């Protein structure tokens, strides 16, 4: 809820692009995070193992988004 209002205020200031909404989406911590995975493997178990590893990495990102959001 706060992210929607804050993005509107930022657009009121300068806007002229969709940069601010995207960076909030990258940096927000209370919403599901969009992830990119390589997974240069074909076996299902290996793909699941890599996806879980990346989920743990994204969990680290969510934890440390405090410095950015402040």
């Amino acid at each position: 809820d706060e992210g929607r209002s804050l993005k509107l205020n930022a657009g009121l200031i300068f806007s002229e692009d969709k940069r601010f909404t995207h960076v909030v989406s990258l940096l927000a911590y209370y919403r599901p995070t969009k992830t990119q995975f390589f997974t240069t493997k074909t076996e299902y178990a290996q793909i699941l193992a890599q996806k879980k590893y990346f989920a743990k990495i994204m969990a680290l990102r969510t934890c440390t988004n405090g410095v950015g959001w402040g």
């Binding site: 940069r19 601010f20 990119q36 995975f37 390589f38 240069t40 590893y53 990495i57």
Partner: protein, 37 residues
């Protein structure tokens, strides 16, 4: 406080994609080996 473009792009890439030994580019001992990463 400028909202630069290319700077945002570089910090974006460093933000995304874990890289490291995993992906592409004795139990406590394994726990410590992971914990370092």
């Amino acid at each position: 406080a400028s909202g630069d473009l290319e700077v945002l792009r570089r910090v974006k890439y460093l933000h995304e994609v874990a890289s490291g030994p995993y992906s592409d580019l004795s139990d406590p001992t394994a726990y410590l080996e992971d914990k370092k990463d």
